[PDB]
Amino acid sequence: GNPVMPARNAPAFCDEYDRFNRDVAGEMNAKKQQNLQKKEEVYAVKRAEQ
Amino acid sequence: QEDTTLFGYESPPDTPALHRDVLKWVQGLDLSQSLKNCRRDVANGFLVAEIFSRYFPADIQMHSFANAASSHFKRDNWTQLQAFCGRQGINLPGDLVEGCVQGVHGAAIALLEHLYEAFTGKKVPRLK
Amino acid sequence: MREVISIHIGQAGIQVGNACWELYCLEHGIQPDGQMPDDAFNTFFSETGAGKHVPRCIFLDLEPTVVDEVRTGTYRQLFHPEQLISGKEDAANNFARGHYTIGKEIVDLALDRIRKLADNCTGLQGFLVFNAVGGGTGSGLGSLLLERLSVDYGKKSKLGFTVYPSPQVSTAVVEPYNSVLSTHSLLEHTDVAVMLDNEAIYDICRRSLDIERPTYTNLNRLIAQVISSLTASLRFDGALNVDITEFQTNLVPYPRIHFMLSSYAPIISAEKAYHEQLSVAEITNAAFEPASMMVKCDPRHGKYMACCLMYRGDVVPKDVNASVATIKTKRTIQFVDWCPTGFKCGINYQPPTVVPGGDLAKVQRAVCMISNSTAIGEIFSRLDHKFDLMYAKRAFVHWYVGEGMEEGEFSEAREDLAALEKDFEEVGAE
Amino acid sequence: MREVISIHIGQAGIQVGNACWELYCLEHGIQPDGQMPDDAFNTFFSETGAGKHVPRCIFLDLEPTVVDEVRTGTYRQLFHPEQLISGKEDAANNFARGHYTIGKEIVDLALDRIRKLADNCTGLQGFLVFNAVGGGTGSGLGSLLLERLSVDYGKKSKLGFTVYPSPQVSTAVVEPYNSVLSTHSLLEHTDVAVMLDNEAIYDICRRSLDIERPTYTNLNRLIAQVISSLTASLRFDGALNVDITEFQTNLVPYPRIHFMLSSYAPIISAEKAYHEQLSVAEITNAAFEPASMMVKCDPRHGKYMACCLMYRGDVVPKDVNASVATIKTKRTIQFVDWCPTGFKCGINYQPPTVVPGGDLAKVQRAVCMISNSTAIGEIFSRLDHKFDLMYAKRAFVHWYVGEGMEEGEFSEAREDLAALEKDFEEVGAE
Amino acid sequence: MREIVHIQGGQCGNQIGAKFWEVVSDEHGIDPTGTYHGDSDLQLERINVYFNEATGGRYVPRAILMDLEPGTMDSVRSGPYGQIFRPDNFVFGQTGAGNNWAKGHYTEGAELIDSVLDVVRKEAESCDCLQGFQVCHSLGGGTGSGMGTLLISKIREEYPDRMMLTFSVVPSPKVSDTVVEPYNATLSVHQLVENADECMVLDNEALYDICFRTLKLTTPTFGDLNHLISAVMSGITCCLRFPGQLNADLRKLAVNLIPFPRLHFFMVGFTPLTSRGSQQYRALTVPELTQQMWDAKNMMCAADPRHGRYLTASALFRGRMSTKEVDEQMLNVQNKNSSYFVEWIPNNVKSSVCDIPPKGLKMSATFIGNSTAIQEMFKRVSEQFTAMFRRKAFLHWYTGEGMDEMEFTEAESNMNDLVSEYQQYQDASAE
Amino acid sequence: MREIVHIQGGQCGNQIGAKFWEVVSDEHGIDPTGTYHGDSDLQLERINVYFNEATGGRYVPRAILMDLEPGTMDSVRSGPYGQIFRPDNFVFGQTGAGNNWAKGHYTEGAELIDSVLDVVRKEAESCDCLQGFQVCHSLGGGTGSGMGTLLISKIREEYPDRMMLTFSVVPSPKVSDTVVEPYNATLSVHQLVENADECMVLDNEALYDICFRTLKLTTPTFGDLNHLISAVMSGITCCLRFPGQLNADLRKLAVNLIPFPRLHFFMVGFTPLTSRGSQQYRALTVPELTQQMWDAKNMMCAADPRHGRYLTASALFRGRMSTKEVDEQMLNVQNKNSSYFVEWIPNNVKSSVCDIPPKGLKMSATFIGNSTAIQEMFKRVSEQFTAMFRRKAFLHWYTGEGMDEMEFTEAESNMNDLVSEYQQYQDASAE
Ligand SMILES: Nc1nc2c(ncn2[C@@H]2O[C@H](COP(=O)(O)OP(=O)(O)OP(=O)(O)O)[C@@H](O)[C@H]2O)c(=O)[nH]1
């Protein structure tokens, strides 16, 4: 295959969907919300440990 | 090669202190703050700002300058100061300004001497 | 009765228009197709007999991609199909291309549609022209359109929300060239020009909204919020109503000096909200903070000439008076000697609506501070040397000459910007 | 945010890196495939969008065998294939071969990959250079790499965990030669050099772990435990956190004096485990035992300048303070008169993880004692006569000359080591 | 309506501040989510001294957290009351000061001090009337000492008239944590003498002694020491927050404590600290509280007051108590121990009474003593500083940050002059 | 709706064009039979830029294949995507040019050029709006260089304002395939300087180095190099075919890139090129893409940019990305490597963003650099041309096909003048 063509199961790989999405702000907002929730959960776990 | 370090410890440069005429000129000029340490008190550029304001009231305003220790605010003060110096015709050396913002020993002393020459009737500092 | 005609020129203009019209539809409850389940929409929308509301806007571009994105997006049934105007060839960052060769037929059709739009307005507060200073479409075509508007409409207030190049960060190379050309063009045509810098708005998004990767959509959302706050007095009632005509009379000390710094407050994410009081005094202080400026121009460098404040939400004249008195007593903020008051406060009872999916939180109070201050000469000082540094070698000058420009035009634009620098220095000096 | 870049040069560097990365994978739960079933791994691993964690390490060697062993072994899916950098010809225990002729292209590629690695780190606490003073690759190529890192990166703290030749036992013949050369090289480049000796670690393995046949895997496991204890404060929280910048500040009195004795405690097998109390005071005393030194250098001969204690596990500040007070009251432990405090205690709440298949037991408490003391001049004194004994006859000198060196390089290295001896004598003296 | 702006500096300062805010929230009935659950009018009566009301019923502490490394305030946010603080008030760098006063004061402290002062000003202007600022931090640490002293200088410049309160954890005499504690302490004391209006000294070893001997705890972690510090920090300002039979604010305490501007260092202690076993056997009376109060074991400072002379001493009592009882106890203490009290002041005690005792304790009392005993602490720190400075060990770290060697000598001279003034007023005779 | 006419010339040009059309058909989801099986609206939104609609759903590429020997076209037609091209667009002669620029430009290129221009005119008149033409061919070959320069001149004459983009495979520095490569290159560069608006230099040895070092491909076929070239050729125009957050067409790139008309040669590179081994290990971020992009080894031209100075550089990014992140990365690159950037242009970067990444890649970025480093490549070509022309070796074939000897001198003079201009702007100082 084409060397430029990424292999499956790679950080570079994206399906045909998630390509042509053309939505950056929504993805960043969703990732920000997920990171905030994960950070709150981590703080809760550390609080429980302390 | 012979070294003068204490196991790699290089003592600070220990530059000579300001000239008495420069200190007297600064003291006679009305300033809110005082020259305790030349390096520390001139690095921010606020004292230079007050001196330039006293010599040129309309050109230099105290509000444009901020008394902050940050590199950003120090650079803003010194850059607007250099812009006014270039516009007026006063020679403010960029190397001395950079040494002053970085707290290089003697840079602020030389800068104060240069300003005292530019302003106080070119009364050349008594050297040698 | 209080209609305002919106013009969006170039990719930047159309992309901020998307955010603006999304915000207006959300604020007035108008669904994206056009109809909603009094007469507060009349400023931005004209209703048809069927009940569907069509905006009084014109999307102008020489590149088909940006306009076709709107034609295919959610707002395909809202805007008028002929109101969306598409070119065939892009201006290619060329002021001459957008002003002399490609822009002619496009601007003729644009004036035709603008005639049709104004004929449907009983009153007309003015035009809100959103273009891109630093691109051939925005600069050249926008300048030509502004000149034609000044010729035919005459005394109608044209408020140009222009985007100038940032000091260090940029995306184009001939950006100083076409920026200088467009600034020379619009010095004499726009009534109030508002400067906007992508670097400053990026810093605002990074620091205030905690967005480590801000984008054009976020920038346009902030700009749209500013414009909605600016127009709120036209659509929603409140004490101390302020008008488009009053913006000049309280902001433009002299005809040449009409460039404006803009700042919105508060800019806080949902997480950071409901942790601070967000009082009127605090939001006014935040608006007067130099970091909150949407222009990479530190206002401490100059002196404020006029400051027009648009308050939205639960704001009382008591609080605005106290906050403005504290601002006047502040030593860091300095006003010119010849303007004792220099303040134009206007309150509105409608809180700023929040766009779902955005980062701005639901805040019950908001401030839009638009100021004339002489510090704005600094950005012109930056562009004036960025221009002449390139102009010394005549780099990219043949590109501009090929579409019917002359070296005399470059010389005239540079001299006019130097004269603008001189005027700013003069009005700043006692 | 607390990224630390690991460099493993030569056979010993790679072989201790294998143990180090096995230990880090066990500590953070990272399976050998690369991914684990927060953000504590960021110090040693950078995560990709796929979820797989890759170490921020660089295996540098001029011989293909050691690197191919890693490429074939269990951790073939863990390490970055290009980060494993392999030469074609070995340095043949020749400092000149590894520093002037063969090392050039290899160090160029190593700096390229190191730049790529540092570009992926928000913060950068420093570099952990693991080499073998006494072999051409580790000495020569390691010295060249350290010099280039000093030139380009500058003030980043480089901690060199060097392995000097043991006093009596050794495996090479030109080991004194290339050891003296590399010592002259790294006196002026590394920030903190941690001293290790195979003889002392064999002593530890035989006496404490009751291993009658210690081997390199055991030695590397002990070294890996020590480095993990040193870096534990970066990855896991606890009272009295210690930082990479803090080691140099509280351990280096003068830039020349930055060589450190290292001692781990407890070193006990599971058979002998749970058979003594293993209190904080007892493990501190064990750490201060002259036998627990990983360098065949009796601290009784010299005087301690500074002692950084790193506690892991169920450790309480009252107990560390009591133990350190007992150590100060102790007479045989002697400090320099100009360092009254001489102690830097730091605790971590994460107990040391146990490597399956290793001999170390699961202990709830651990101490890593890293000390600057003037006794370390003794090992340089041994190498200084081991060097000149051959240098009088110029034995094996033609080998070094053939690959682009001169008599002056040997003379300068010997004079520099003599200067280091004099400096240690002077700091020890009042 | 007299606000206090709390600032936490460094790892130790941040941990102490988090414990203090937890204790204050417990005292005012505030849950970690910010809501009030106290069921007492007086708790909300003066909650504005420390807290601000958000859009809802949430209360946010008027606290500003400072650091050059983000891990410490990550731990703070993971702490029990990490969620009350406003997220904007967390001001952090990226590389911590490696126990380097020069790094925390000049190089790395310079950039972050903009954000620190911006947040301080934002919090201060919102205050209707401002009693002052209080900074909790540890002498002998890079970011803590350096950034704290720099911020205190800036705040003194901006608000000279507003009160300045410092809770500094001076390095302990016997067991030192970091090697450069004497340098950092010497450089910080020079700044605190010039800038800080009121400064209180805490020692970790003294707190260990008090929690081992009085509380009889077997394994006291840093949490217990921060708990005692939080108790003292609350008790000093409880008169602002609660009605008092004879109330006394921070400025009144400073006026009645500080005879001369440079002699503003105080040793503090809290009563009643009782071991869990002897809680039943001890009877809560004003004489018992005073007896524990004046015991040299109760001081949280290493220096014992017996060696020095009490220049002044303020005692803030809390609970239902007799003003006659308290005043007679203080006068009897003065008469009995007149040798330990300075002669040229007729009354060396500033007594204050508050009606609101801490929860669970029927009565309590906090002590703030200005005595020439702190002279020996400064003397010991100077003994270490001179020993290290003669051979110039670890001086290169401070020199490489752009600090002149002359600054060390200036700080040492200031500290020695402070010692000299303390000795002068220890041996000063009337007439 | 801004159409582009593709032209392939010579064997190398035909192979590269076939690979490029395969890549574009895959990216737009077109099967080798031409039917749309792409499963996305955006793919068909702007398919008219490269393709035309046939009777049914078939899409015919707007490509014209030109050659003097039918073997290369027969192979292309028998290849996987040989059936999409319209058979009328295959213009071939009967006797191939024996690596002779004279045969490909004067004797045999004359007869076939009429048919070639006929096909070009038929394709161009069908276009609603024409951005221009892109011609892919190889310098250093007879038919390729010959009719490439000839057709470029003819199309320049017919359509002066329309864009001309060229992908010329300049003969490689170290390994040379044919002997007369310097002659053909010298004759062709002179034509490209006058005619081509925008010229893209590709070297087979640079491609081998990049695919052996970054891709770690050990024995790379010509198909691999053609496919890298195809990726670049797609990415240069993806802003025309797909919606972009900040789009930039060919004319915008040319305006922002070319400071002066004769300095229109560029070196290009594609990111992210990853070896199969490290594909899971590499994480795609805009800084990573820029770091790989600005690397000298990433350039597909043999000249390395370190020797020269970047006059201008455009980067077309593709994927859902932050404009702030991209702009910050490019500004930081400029600041760090200011020594390599021309001083009298404040911003040497034209950044464009398209929202549609290529197939398989989350993000990509194609780079186009105008730097004075091309000086050394033209210098080497002149070093070989002068050495051959001094002794007039192999000159008799070109002489017998009917050009004066003075044409060689004029071409060499023009190339030397171009080298002189590049050196002038390399060492030009501001003010
Ligand atoms: N703030 C902001 N600025 C934008 C945005 N989009 C584009 N710009 C700016 O707009 C400038 C160019 O705009 P345009 O002239 O309309 O680009 P175009 O549509 O391709 O037209 P030409 O460039 O003239 O050929 C760029 O320099 C950007 O800085 C946006 O979404 N937000």
Ligand SMILES: Nc1nc2c(ncn2[C@@H]2O[C@H](COP(=O)(O)OP(=O)(O)OP(=O)(O)O)[C@@H](O)[C@H]2O)c(=O)[nH]1
């Ligand atoms: N502690 C320890 N030392 C080791 C180990 N392996 C090798 N060494 C030491 O490393 C020294 C030589 O290492 P290297 O220079 O890397 O050997 P090399 O990889 O063949 O490279 P050259 O010898 O320079 O050609 C020997 O003298 C050993 O004493 C190990 O596993 N543990």
Ligand SMILES: Nc1nc2c(ncn2[C@@H]2O[C@H](COP(=O)(O)OP(=O)(O)O)[C@@H](O)[C@H]2O)c(=O)[nH]1
């Ligand atoms: N009372 C108390 N002291 C502490 C705590 N954490 C650290 N310390 C002490 O504070 C001193 C200074 O450390 P610190 O200033 O916080 O380090 P920095 O944050 O890097 O400046 C050390 O000697 C510690 O012993 C704590 O939680 N409570």
Ligand SMILES: Nc1nc2c(ncn2[C@@H]2O[C@H](COP(=O)(O)OP(=O)(O)O)[C@@H](O)[C@H]2O)c(=O)[nH]1
């Ligand atoms: N990248 C690439 N280069 C090629 C290919 N085929 C030929 N070349 C190179 O192109 C150069 C010119 O050959 P070419 O112009 O195709 O020969 P012509 O058709 O007879 O003129 C030769 O030196 C080859 O090395 C190919 O498929 N890909």
